[PDB]
Here is the input.
Amino acid sequence: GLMQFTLPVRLCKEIELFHFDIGPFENMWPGIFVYMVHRSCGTSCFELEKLCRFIMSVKKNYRRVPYHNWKHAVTVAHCMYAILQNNHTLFTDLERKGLLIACLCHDLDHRGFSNSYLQKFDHPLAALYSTSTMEQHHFSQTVSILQLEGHNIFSTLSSSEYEQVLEIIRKAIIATDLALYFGNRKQLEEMYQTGSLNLNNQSHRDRVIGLMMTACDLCSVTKLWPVTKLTANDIYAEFWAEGDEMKKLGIQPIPMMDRDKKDEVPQGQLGFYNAVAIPCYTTLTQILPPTEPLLKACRDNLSQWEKVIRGE
Ligand SMILES: Cn1cc(-c2ccccc2)nc1CSc1nc2ccccn2n1
Ligand SMILES: [Mg+2]
Ligand SMILES: [Zn+2]
Here is the structure.
């Protein structure tokens, strides 16, 4: 059924653009992902049946949380697709498969709870994974689906390449732990300003992929303002529900997760743009000039938040 899906020709044009918003096309998301894999990686590299099977299983293991859900997975994969299409030749074919798959799978089985929560309230997952808690779990879920019957889309890879693609996927998913981003962007920016960055240097290459994963993960801020606004609602719906569980336990949450502090949201976004998103896309545009429209769109939404703060 996914196997016989064909993308409407109007989308074939729009999907290539960074600002493309998948939201209005829920029924088409699995088929959008196939399309993107076929365009980037070619039509002959995965068995169609397996890919579709794998996709429908990835969907099934995303939970119905307000933000970290199937819609989010596809949004992040789409941003990567546009990054890759615009920078096709800088990356190996193996990196394109892994990085599209990693993005689809990067928040697999998210409960609507942060790493801090699981750590603070000594959740089992935080016992198995001490840092990048959920992110290690997300990868562990990725491998588990790959290992299901008729799901191993990489089964025609040699052993060497299978373990290469898993490693690209592992690093990529871990990179989506925002705690790791700040150090990553700092190094990458220094490597850039000192003329020392080298894409054939593998550790550098891992870092650039890291920044890409971040840039994809945050990409709500690069959509048109009305889509940006509406996604923020999803983000805070999930944060506030976590802060609610903390209050039930007589723990005052951080303001970000306290629905009683929503007046502080516009300034909370403002800060996030200044400390996180603007710098991300700034360094990303430096390394990969064709990704500039992400920074442009990010800047436009920053100034919308600046407008909001002052009664506009
Ligand atoms: C950091 N922060 C802090 C606040 C805030 C909100 C209300 C009260 C006090 C602080 N909001 C934020 C924005 S959190 C965030 N995370 C993502 C991921 C993708 C796209 C947008 N955001 N915003
Ligand atoms: Mg995540
Ligand atoms: Zn994510």
